[PDB]
């Protein structure tokens, strides 16, 4: 998955 940015 993606890195959390919000």
């Amino acid at each position: 998955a993606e890195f959390r940015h919000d």
Partner: antibody
Amino acid sequence: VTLKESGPGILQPSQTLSLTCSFSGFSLSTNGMGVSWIRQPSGKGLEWLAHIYWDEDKRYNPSLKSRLTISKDTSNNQVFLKITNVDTADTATYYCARRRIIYDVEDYFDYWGQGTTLTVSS
Amino acid sequence: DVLMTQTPLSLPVSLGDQASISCRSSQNIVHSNGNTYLEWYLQKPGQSPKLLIYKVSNRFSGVPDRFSGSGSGTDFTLKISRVEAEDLGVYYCFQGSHVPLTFGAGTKLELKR
């Protein structure tokens, strides 16, 4: 804003590394705030290790997520990283950088420590 | 795992030349919130790295506009017009959209002679 890594330089294969990052100029309870750890072998590239957020969320480099544990001491402005069962491959300089999110205009690694050194050898 | 591959790996320049640095990702790096987290870092010997560009084309506060970054999707460039002795060092591009977060092997900005 500053950061300073401390920890044992030199461990032996399989021992546990416990690394400390003492920061200031910011606070890990500040909405969006976070620190991560990045290490770099001699004459080589940067490898990102793990990252911890203000809401205690965490995120690990999956190829190591297992030998890694990240944690904070909000009250005492500190961030720790533990690597279990180390080996010569973990020989490197370890940095901690700050990185905040929510607002994309602050979302980057603006501040890094001076870096601390580890050699794994028997 | 996004592989960032930079070019050249060494770049000899004369003080006051222009210099480009290409960086291409092994796959698209536009996060699902719409932001492309491409960043450039510069490291001098014995220093830590320091942030030059973020979000592809944005200069970080304190960075001379003689540095500029371009790119889209999977293909990115750093340009330095009028290179200065303080610009000599190693340049890493970085993507921060996918886990794990990753940097290039870095490019060595060196002096011509």
